[PDB]
Amino acid sequence: MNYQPTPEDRFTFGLWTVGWQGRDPFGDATRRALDPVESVRRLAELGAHGVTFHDDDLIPFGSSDSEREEHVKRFRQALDDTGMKVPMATTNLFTHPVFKDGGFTANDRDVRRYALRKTIRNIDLAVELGAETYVAWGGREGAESGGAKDVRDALDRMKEAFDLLGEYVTSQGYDIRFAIEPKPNEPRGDILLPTVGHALAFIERLERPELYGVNPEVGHEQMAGLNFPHGIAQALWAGKLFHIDLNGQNGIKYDQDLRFGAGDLRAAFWLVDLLESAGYSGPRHFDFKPPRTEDFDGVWASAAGCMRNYLILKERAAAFRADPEVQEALRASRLDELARPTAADGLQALLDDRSAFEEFDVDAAAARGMAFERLDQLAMDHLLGARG
Amino acid sequence: MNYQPTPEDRFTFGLWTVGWQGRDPFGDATRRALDPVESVRRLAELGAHGVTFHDDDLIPFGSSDSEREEHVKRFRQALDDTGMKVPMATTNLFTHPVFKDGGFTANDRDVRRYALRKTIRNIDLAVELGAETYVAWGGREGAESGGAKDVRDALDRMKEAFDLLGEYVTSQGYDIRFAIEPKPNEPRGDILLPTVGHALAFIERLERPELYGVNPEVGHEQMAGLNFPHGIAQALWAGKLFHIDLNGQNGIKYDQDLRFGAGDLRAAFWLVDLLESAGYSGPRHFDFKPPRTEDFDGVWASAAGCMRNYLILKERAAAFRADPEVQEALRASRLDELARPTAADGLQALLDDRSAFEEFDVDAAAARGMAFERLDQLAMDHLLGARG
Amino acid sequence: MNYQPTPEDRFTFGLWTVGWQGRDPFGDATRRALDPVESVRRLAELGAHGVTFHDDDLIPFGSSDSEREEHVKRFRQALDDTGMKVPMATTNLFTHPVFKDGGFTANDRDVRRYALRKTIRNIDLAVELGAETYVAWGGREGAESGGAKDVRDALDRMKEAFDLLGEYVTSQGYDIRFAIEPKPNEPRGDILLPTVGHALAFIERLERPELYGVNPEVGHEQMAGLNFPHGIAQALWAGKLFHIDLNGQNGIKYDQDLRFGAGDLRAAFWLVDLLESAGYSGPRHFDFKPPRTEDFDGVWASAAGCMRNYLILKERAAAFRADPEVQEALRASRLDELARPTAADGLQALLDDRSAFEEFDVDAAAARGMAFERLDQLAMDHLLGARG
Amino acid sequence: MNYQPTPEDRFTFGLWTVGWQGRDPFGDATRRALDPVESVRRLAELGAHGVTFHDDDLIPFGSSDSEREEHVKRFRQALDDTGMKVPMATTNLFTHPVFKDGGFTANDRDVRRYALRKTIRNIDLAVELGAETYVAWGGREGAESGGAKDVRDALDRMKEAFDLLGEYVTSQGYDIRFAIEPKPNEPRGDILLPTVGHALAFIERLERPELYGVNPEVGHEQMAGLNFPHGIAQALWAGKLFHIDLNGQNGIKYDQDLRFGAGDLRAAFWLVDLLESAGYSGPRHFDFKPPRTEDFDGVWASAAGCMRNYLILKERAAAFRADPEVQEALRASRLDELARPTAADGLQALLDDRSAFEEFDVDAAAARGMAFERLDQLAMDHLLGARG
């Protein structure tokens, strides 16, 4: 009577997630390295729809052209053998010491050019393996101190970099779009474009804004104590939710990348509620790290859980929305009134309307309860499976 | 040998700041109410350039037309008697119980209309007393629970409201522009447009974006653990820093509104550094609360401090920038390289350049120190007055 | 097929909770004042076991002796009419302006004496109405700035105050014990004894430590980003959990006092799990505020929810613990090994044991998976009612 | 006219600080490994008083007895050649994969025994090289999920471990004491004894509490948003500040370990103020990481800065305390009254005193300003070197 995921649920996983070897700021790897081909096979057996990669996840840094060929072909045969897809890809511009002050916004001009060139090389690959989205996570763009980075110049260089990528893309006639992934900090003291809001606003300054959107991560917005569903709704309102990274985070601290459903469970529910009601049809991508306490059996247990919790949440939110008792409470709370225009009649009519000011009875309106706590308990009940 | 502010330094204060009576979530007022005319007189003696107001700060809620006249005239005579200006004004849409679920985004349609009408009434007043900026702080737009607010509808209503304001403004031919002030939370559990980034991005969806910018507050961005100078630089890059609210905050907790210079002192320094180097020429506005421990003597002490700390900071940052030893370190750290274009030569040339990839020596570039810690200690030394 | 609470579940509520009139830092009351007698009657109908009070909640500040009599008698008749008890009481030393720099640790000596005297007066009352626990929440003990409070002197005055209370208590031969409630901040910038840990440690310096324990609040520890069940377990290990305050909080920000089950739901589950397994038999006390959006109907809805969520949680945690599949996983994860002594054999034997160092195979032990993610998903499944 | 540190200032540094190779959760080392003997020599030239070590910092894990000899002797010759001391030492129980679920509180009994044995081996070494303090940082004691760790059992095992260490120590007749270092999180999701308060309270449950105190770190308390000087004062009041770790942290996020003076500058000032006024005579130990952006020249620049900022702070705080204008303001704010007993006259006299309640004029006392903002601006002025 369960929640088994199928490739139609569009669940994806990054190679670096289940492949995380468990090295952290204070300790060595607890797990041996996984061959990408094993990961593809194991995730498919679990019902994943596909996998995503960093260039250096697939092809080890410094690899020879003929080594590149080998890594790709082998990866290609695994994806052919399993039906798995590659909907998204990204570049690693944060691990190698050369990127210690950034990729696109490093102070050293020659480093910024190298970063562009390593990114462009990987977009051709990504296109080849059929990704539709290309993610950019500028984890090293930022600073630990105020004098080290002039942020107006850094944003000029960031825009310069995204504009060049967009020009490259259109000239090759590729179908791919870009998704910028925000993070407020870690590993830099502060990171540029630290939240969904910052990312959306930056995009509006680009040459061809239509090529760019956001890839928000649950844990990253929560590292700034923000409401993630609220941020996702602003991205949907803007037509910019191109991709999404799902995981768990317990409040404001280091980036935990726990399995989805872990961390803020109610946030999880409201997010699924929103993705499902808006009709989000992009990949459901997990960016998570199975804790370093675990062996390979716990890794696959943790990955399976990501998908299971999504499905359970999905069922509980459908039940909530469909419940006649909840639809009535939503009317009681005037959500229906929220969706009607405030002044369709227009400015002039508003100004002339005595019932909107001069004869508005503020005190009776003030007295009206919103009935939000009864509504939220109905949501609680539905989440916990305790309606009655 | 001091730091006395003058009206030319453009220091402003809200009526509600020095007038804060010290009521907080857990306690009654510790200070008696101040007459606006006394505040204008006292701030001018301290060297303030002007004052700002909420409608209900100036004219008590429910005031009769002929009472309105009285409050304004008296306020007018004080400003004539002192040379003080009114560069900014705003509406109170958060105190009255009718706004408990919001103003522009309340679920109740009739409340949203009332809010527009109370705002429009105050823009005419503001214009009359000569403000150039009209601030909007939607402190009650948001929610404590997920079902209570559909955020896509709420953003449709928020835009609807700002568009109507903009239409009103152009039709009256007024010279005023709008500044939206972000806050992540408090008094609502979560607030819509919670940071500078969110606010800038929303503005790009408005009918006439040129009429709107942001009024960021030091403490509000810091309630989300963000880097405030970094946020201010993004607002400057976007040409949207219309106004700014200065104060102090000690990390992530309730909105403290401490006097400017309190809270994160180094953040204070880097901010002044930035406003001064960008050539910000708007008002230097303090949104602060003298702690409720204080009597009227401590109130004026706390207001004088706001201005004093700005000036001290201003002197230390000029000294830093002007220091030949610092200019050399900035070169050492390649800030000069940050401000040059990455690929002025263009995409094609970048792709063809072997020195940007194929023959790029990553390891030598990796080996180059950024020299940021020596630079930051020089900044430290300058701040503390300990160069040597 | 529900979760109806009964007086045997020991659910209590403070007069100030359902009576909260909804005044917050930025807005007026949205609800009229409740007569304590109405609250007692309404909570009893909901199945509460009892109520708790601040002195000034029951008897308005400045009340005449003969007014005191009136308030008490009336309150007494309501408790007789309903079977409701008064297990806990406390003093208000934070609302009146005289306490603006604190009660027990105010800088002014005469204020500290007044605070003691107002507290002692209320302990006699509390005893009279039969409370067994007397809570102290020093919300005003602390500071906004470093020079204002010497913390070593303030702790000497705090101890002095608790020692005097303890002497008073023993000399009257009263049966009551003290519970100190920690809070990290708000309304002061920083508050003394900011967490459970600080409170427990302070208590060990008192004259008669056995008279004092802690009354931790869910939201307060979470305002410091701490793990509340973890803090509660340390209090239980110390034999100091005298009382507990239950509510909801969404991470690090202002003190929300949401209804219990709101905020961190998984934290809620693990807490109930712990109170239930340790055999906590004290009151289940809610310190919450029905949001100011609500009318009286939402108030009682919100209070009923506190109790309902506890019961649902209670059922899910019993189910988890009782599940044979979970008991096996706990063995898989070696929780059984955690509860056995490390070196019962003693130091000498440990030192001599070659299998503990010299011939310990670190690499095989390193290879052993902890199996925590499978265990946590079983916990997830149980919480959500989705075992299968 | 400078701030050159001397060995008499008692400045110490851990081998792992300047030796940090800059590997972080998202990137490889940017610096080559330093030989401990080079570090000792370089720090001495900078005026350090001594160095501290983890066992595995000095002697590489798995080292043969005869390799141990070699590492020690060489280290010994460097300390003889420079006059440098070793006031503190500690054990690494967090890096090796065997410690992934902890050292003293790992679920696996055999791991807990190994951890004790590796710790005891290093105490003999520490004693030999003359340390007086032995630090314990249980960075791996804790959990990512609720079921994984029963905290009451874990505290029983933690106590068991510290008691055994204490027994070992007394039986060998060693002069060394223990200092427990708290951290709220990272690398575990939550860490046991997460703050100074928790650590002090735990210690009171040990067999011989006099052997144990705390080694608080500036950044760790600030990761929980706490006031560090306030925590240090509670540790001093308790007579438990055995050692202290100095560094910088920018609010609530990952453990930054910035150079001392970085992060919260005003917190830095008030801390130095307190250590200096209490007469703290222990080592001034820096636990910091030169950012991975830096080369060896920036490493020594960053270490020199730690010491320089302490000295500058030290001078500014002495100036503040010594200033007649500040001594008067302190009287104005009644700090003198804070240090007098509240009721030396005793309970009975307090109860009988009509001036403490019955005839106490609350309203006049309420009216008295605390004058804290003038005092704090005088502190500001002194810090910035702008008195006038």
Curated annotation (Swiss-Prot), chains A, B, C, D:
GO terms for cellular component: cytoplasm. Its EC number is 5.3.1.5. Mg(2+) 1 binds at E181, E217, D245, D287. Its cofactor is Mg(2+). GO terms for molecular function: identical protein binding; magnesium ion binding; xylose isomerase activity. Pfam families: AP_endonuc_2. The active site is at H54, D57. The keyword NADP does not apply. Involved in D-xylose catabolism. This is Xylose isomerase. The lineage of its organism: Bacteria, Bacillati, Actinomycetota, Actinomycetes, Kitasatosporales.
